[PDB]
Amino acid sequence: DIEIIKRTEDKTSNKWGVTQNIQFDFVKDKKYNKDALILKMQGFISSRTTYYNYKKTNHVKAMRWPFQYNIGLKTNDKYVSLINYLPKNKIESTNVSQTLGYNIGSFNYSKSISYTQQNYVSEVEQQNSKSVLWGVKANSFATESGQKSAFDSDLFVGYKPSKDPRDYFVPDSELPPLVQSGFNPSFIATVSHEKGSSDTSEFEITYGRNMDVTHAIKRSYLDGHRVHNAFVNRNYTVKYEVNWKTHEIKVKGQN
Amino acid sequence: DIEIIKRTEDKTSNKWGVTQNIQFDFVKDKKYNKDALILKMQGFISSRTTYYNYKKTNHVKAMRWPFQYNIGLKTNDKYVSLINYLPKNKIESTNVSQTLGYNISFNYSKSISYTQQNYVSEVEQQNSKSVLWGVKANSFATESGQKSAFDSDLFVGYKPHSKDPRDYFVPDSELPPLVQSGFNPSFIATVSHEKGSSDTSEFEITYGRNMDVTHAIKRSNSYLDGHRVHNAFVNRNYTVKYEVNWKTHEIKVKGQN
Amino acid sequence: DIEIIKRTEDKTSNKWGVTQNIQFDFVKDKKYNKDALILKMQGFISSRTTYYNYKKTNHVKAMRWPFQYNIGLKTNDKYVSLINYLPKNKIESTNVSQTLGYNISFNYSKSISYTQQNYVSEVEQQNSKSVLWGVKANSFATESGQKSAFDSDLFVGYKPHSKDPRDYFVPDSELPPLVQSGFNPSFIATVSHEKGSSDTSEFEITYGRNMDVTHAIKRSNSYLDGHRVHNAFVNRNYTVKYEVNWKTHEIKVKGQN
Amino acid sequence: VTLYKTTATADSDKFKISQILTFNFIKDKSYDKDTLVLKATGNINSGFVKPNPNDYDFSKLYWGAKYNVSISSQSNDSVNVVDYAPKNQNEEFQVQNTLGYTNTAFSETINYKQESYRTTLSRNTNYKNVGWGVEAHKIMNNGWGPYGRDSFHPTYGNELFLAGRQSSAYAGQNFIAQHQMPLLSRSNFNPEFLSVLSHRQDGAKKSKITVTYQREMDLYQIRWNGFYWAGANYKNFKTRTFKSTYEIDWENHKVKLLDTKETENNK
Amino acid sequence: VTLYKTTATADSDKFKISQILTFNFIKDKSYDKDTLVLKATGNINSGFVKPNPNDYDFSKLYWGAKYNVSISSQSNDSVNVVDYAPKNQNEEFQVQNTLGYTNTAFSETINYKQESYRTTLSRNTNYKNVGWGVEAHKIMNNGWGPYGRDSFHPTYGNELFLAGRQSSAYAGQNFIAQHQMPLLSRSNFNPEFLSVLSHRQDGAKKSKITVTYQREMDLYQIRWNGFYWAGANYKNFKTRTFKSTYEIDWENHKVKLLDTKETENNK
Amino acid sequence: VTLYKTTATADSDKFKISQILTFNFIKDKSYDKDTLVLKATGNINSGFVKPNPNDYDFSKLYWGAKYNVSISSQSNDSVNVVDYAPKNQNEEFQVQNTLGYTFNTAFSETINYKQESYRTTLSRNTNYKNVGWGVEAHKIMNNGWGPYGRDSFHPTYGNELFLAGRQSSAYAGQNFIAQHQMPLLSRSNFNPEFLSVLSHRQDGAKKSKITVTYQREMDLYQIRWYWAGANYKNFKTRTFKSTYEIDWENHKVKLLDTKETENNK
Amino acid sequence: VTLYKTTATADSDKFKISQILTFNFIKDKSYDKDTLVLKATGNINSGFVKPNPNDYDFSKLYWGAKYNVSISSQSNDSVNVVDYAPKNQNEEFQVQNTLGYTTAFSETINYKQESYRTTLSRNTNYKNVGWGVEAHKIMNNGWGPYGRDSFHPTYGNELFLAGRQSSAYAGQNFIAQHQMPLLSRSNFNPEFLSVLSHRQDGAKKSKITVTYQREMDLYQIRWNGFYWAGANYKNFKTRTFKSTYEIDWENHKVKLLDTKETENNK
């Protein structure tokens, strides 16, 4: 009693270093009184992580890297509305253990909190009936000598003060995959369409990155200075059009 | 094979702060030789937790709160019998680990472990015509360890003297949901009825609370001290009387508290 | 495919304090070329635990208790063979953790872990005509560690001198169920029969106890000291003889101990 | 294989004891007898009686220390009890032994479950009767114990419900808080026992089953002797018993309550 | 048993609040009313406002400290609210008590779940209305806390988002890093609530449901006195509210948005 | 795919060895041979003989230290052993290495594994017409001490396998550990559970022979007054062999012969 | 939904690289394109070269430090790469913070550690997917982890160095072969999945190119008169095997068309 009609598009931009792998599943549910479409947003957003000598200084080198990945979907058809999407923001919950102790004169008290860290966290930045935007944000990294915060100005700062800028920074094996290679988004959105209204609708899908810069300064040891949000909304946008009656997809534009 | 006939009633009382959400499932089991009815007792009993200045004093403030929730079912039809219900009282069971050792000194260790609920549900009375449960404050997880529901210092606060009685007691984030908001009962009962006897039966369902009072007094540099009045108010209860027809499957509300 | 014919017999002996709850499942499996019968051996053997004053003395009391339960099955019919049974003897398996450490001092630790049953079931004898198990007292969890069933002080109590021999021994709450009440055996055996040879077969089923005696002596600041008589009473057993008909599936009890 | 269900109940409001019996009659073409699965539930109040807070140097309370249930058929009928639940437990526990060197260390840890009340079969169980005793077992007082019905300290006697050894008054206020007592000692026991019975098809069409529910109340008292508090527990100082007799119609799978009886004993 | 689905939506762009409503109409031959399972999702921005870093000895920010959702039918119609989720929790925790001799040692450990925001039912919940409040609960300031809306230290006040007590910096720069704040306090709440409604079959074919989404923004301020920093939190200093009214057509299983309303409050 | 079952048994009451053999004949149209799954169970007594408690300075006992089971077809028939269970184990264990500093250095290694009192391995005589297992005393804990086994050696006390105390002041016959402290297989009965799969050629003979052998090796453990211990391996052997005739056409099995043999050195 | 299967293989005996390609053609009435699930397996030898034991104060070995696989369609055909596995990991770890008074702090983190890590090639796009399986966290004995660029100011890269103050020949001062990771000295057995779409109004035949490759690192150690020290040079030798297959979308057949072996030596 449910019929699916499946369509795919795959669009790459060399300029942006982005591939969008988009799947459109039109849902004919006889129990539902509107048209429905499920958009599976996958693909690949390259980290575009890059190293270089700063100005003409020869003792400070810079690493430019993706602090945040951007994924967003928007429609302009007033007959279309967003009815579902994943992932969603969740309440953060932790496990707490607490101990009180007496030794017979001696008192002890212990509190331990435990939880799970992801390298990057996915947050809903904004959402309404016409659109949803997520940001996938650098968070915490497991290193020798403890977990390091994505806001540490020393993050990725290296060990060879060498004149090759790549050497001012941690080796690839101490970089997370989302920094060394990039991000494989997996996002989903379901939209309703009012039957017998517009024949087609436009959806604009946006994939991209915000870049931080870490300057490593030789002082001999290496010291880290951060420029947060150095480059923002470096994004690749593609505009798809769907036909609700014929299930044709057209790519109508891209930046 | 088994046919079910489903009925619902929802009754609210502003006086008592109670909503009874009742589901009546008539069971037609061909393998069973009597009539059967399952009553699913849900809803919301609000805590009615309240704060106030004690009399005319400036240094004594009071918090009134639900120490227990009451849930009861009764019939007066001789042809009806309670044949099942949940929850039922259980034996307390715990996990014990005992160690004995020595060096060449001596050592002994015993540890017990178990799970605590904020409120425990106990069967208080049950016979063929009725069952009564009490859901009773038990133990609470705080910073500084678990605290008993009978601790006179329970919920005593940090802000003497603000003039505001609410400030004499812990903030909402240190109150369990069943005190800050209330209880959503979930109780079930199954009754039999002798076939071709009475056309109708009556059931009374009771939802309510028993309140304690915690008085917070300022002393001495200043701190707050707790004194408890246990069972300050008992059986603050909302009773509704339902009538069932075993032939037509009609439900009627016959009365209220 | 598979047809089962079920029969039951239940036999009690007051002399022996034993009830045999026997189930006979005749199996007609078209893929199997002999007759088959599964015997489910259940029931109840009471511990017959008893306390008494020793001889004419006043400082020596005795507890008689079941160190081992006996369960046995045998047939007389050359056309019948035992082809399966449970429980079976198993190899002891344990978990070992071993650590070796250097502190710049060397440390070495070995720890073994396993599960203890109060009583262990061992296959004492088995052949095509019979099987015999013994269920033997093994280890008991008490305060002050695990006690072996072979400790002469096992069950020795705290109340010298009450005059009542019952007080020379631990109270019921410190006795395992198999000693305070008794054993509920659960044993199973499958036999084949050559079809169509003998019309009937006899099976003799045996349930009983071996009793130890623990003497408690008042000593010296007076305490109780334990002395054991192991295998004080052996094969206190109840035997019942059953005859099956392989064609009519009649069971008859042909005799008892 | 066919199944017929029915139920019956009986009450003693005086004793606060109630029986619920649920009956599953099974006809199995592969078996030569009728089968009946009989579940016994309902309520047995503890008979608990609080201490008077005004007693001075000596006080007592009554608590529910053992519950007995039994179901039995008639010596003259063709009905046998062939199986039942729960059965006596061959209890288990976990062990960890450790041997270390650096200086030597030995250690043994045991792990097991501790029950407030323990269920075991009645010694009177046989082919026409099954019974169970649910008996106070390992009761923790304040994180102290376990204590039981016969716990014995040379000085202090039975400290089961004793609040303090040297408490500054008042007897009757020197028992542990009611809420600290185990549930079955102060409240209601909700039995849940299973029995299977067989009935001969060449027998009477009707037969009689008797079901007894019972409580033993212990008398726990404490006393001050001018120096310290001590406690004593007297087992089964009071007994309350409710026996019902039900008629089973094997042919029509019906059950009627025929009669009931209340008996007590007071030491 | 038959199921019909539809959906409906409403937005306030000015408040950054959107509602998504998913409707499952069940018709069941065994029941004498119509059933509607109503799932309420969407977005409620936190209304968060970062501090100005140029504030010197005194600074403030606004954070989203409570979200309220409510679903109500009308007093005059035959629509009742019969069930819903989540329901208030009778919370649980694990306990381990240990006693050791070698010197006597006591310890008690408890294990429990700690949520940054807690959901409980509204006071006003009744047979025609169900509401939840999702409220800031136990919030960790680095490794310290938990703190909440009403945390109080006699000297430093409420240290909820205070970075240091003796910090040498501008006020607007002595709050914890925004990324150290709980997600719902700075970002967006994505509600997920379920309600079940019954409708009489002799009633009106159409009826009205009102759904309200709301945020309470708290005002958190910190101040230097000359010796140390201290903090204050003022609850519900700004309130933003979005209410939508939907018409249910019970006969045809359709739902239309009728009306929306934005309301705010400012202390 | 059709399945035919039968069973057969044989006993030696003299040796307290008894064989139960369960046969599953499988005919599978997708395969060009007849298949037989043969399960071998029953009993092998340990042959355990307790010590005489009147032995003064020198005592002994016999215990069941190894059990051998073997199943074989005849060199002249078309019956092969194609599979069987249990197989030899490539054993595993868990490891945790730890390195610690305190500003003092600490290293440790913990290993976790299973320990069994008897170990099962395949007979090195196993081949395409014969499979056999040895179930051998392996890791035996005396009290909390050990493990010991059949060849444990202390340069002073020798083999302390069943030795109660090194400096005990009792009779020799009384300085063995309690019987209940011995492993179950050393003092009681081994209940084998072995599986073998056989193939038979369809153009073969309709009947073939299978020979099944159950055996115990008894070790002699002796102690002498300090105290010391010696264990002598397979000082007595007891063997029971049975040959069965398989009728592959009618799926019948029939006991043809039995033989008891022993060795005493 | 209908499924058709086939397989194809290619070998370079010289390089010890072999490709196995398993093909699942799916025709699904609900989709307007042909689907191909393509599984790439086989063998990529590490190229490991043990050190000569007679080297005195300076020695070297080559080890397999990175494996690259890529699957590509032709820029002129209607064949896209729509999905694939494995994808890059947003890695997770467990944390336990503890605060104790008697004042004590501790933080424990728990995570998984791979000796080799797989990540997508940065050339991944709508017509090409590629992966790199790169030496990651390697333990010497119980020391490390080390990798391709480990750097100690004195001893350099102690990746396969047996001791610092060792009295022995260079070439007998590397760690035992069996103490090296499996992929560094043996064979890598790739397992990669790609899903490809093909337009039905397209050509009936198309071409896919599968490349398997190894990067061999040169690791060397030297004695200076006071201590041993090591250096690792990345991708000092490269060995590459590329095969191209013709996919017959109409009849669900695949045919090897050509292979090529290429190398680089620094």
Swiss-Prot record, chain A:
InterPro entries: Bi-component_toxin_staph, Leukocidin/Hemolysin_toxin, Leukocidin/porin_MspA_sf. GO terms for cellular component: extracellular region. Belongs to the aerolysin family. It comes from the Bacteria. It comes from Staphylococcus aureus (strain Mu50 / ATCC 700699). Toxin that seems to act by forming pores in the membrane of the cell. Has a hemolytic and a leucotoxic activity. It holds the Pfam family Leukocidin. This is Gamma-hemolysin component C. Keywords: Cytolysis, Hemolysis, Signal, Toxin, Virulence. Transmembrane segments: none annotated. Toxicity requires sequential binding and synergistic association of a class S and a class F component which form heterooligomeric complexes. HlgC (class S) associates with HlgB (class F) thus forming an CB toxin. The keyword Metal-binding does not apply. GO terms for biological process: cytolysis in another organism. Disulfide bonds: none annotated. One of its GO terms (molecular function) is toxin activity. The lineage of its organism: Bacteria, Bacillati, Bacillota, Bacilli, Bacillales.
Curated annotation (Swiss-Prot), chains B, C:
GO terms for cellular component: extracellular region. One of its GO terms (biological process) is cytolysis in another organism. This is Gamma-hemolysin component C. One of its GO terms (molecular function) is toxin activity. Toxin that seems to act by forming pores in the membrane of the cell. Has a hemolytic and a leucotoxic activity. Toxicity requires sequential binding and synergistic association of a class S and a class F component which form heterooligomeric complexes. HlgC (class S) associates with HlgB (class F) thus forming an CB toxin. NCBIfam families: hlyII (TIGR01002). The keyword Oxidoreductase does not apply. The lineage of its organism: Bacteria, Bacillati, Bacillota, Bacilli, Bacillales. SUPFAM superfamilies: Leukocidin-like (SSF56959). Keywords: Cytolysis, Hemolysis, Signal, Toxin, Virulence.
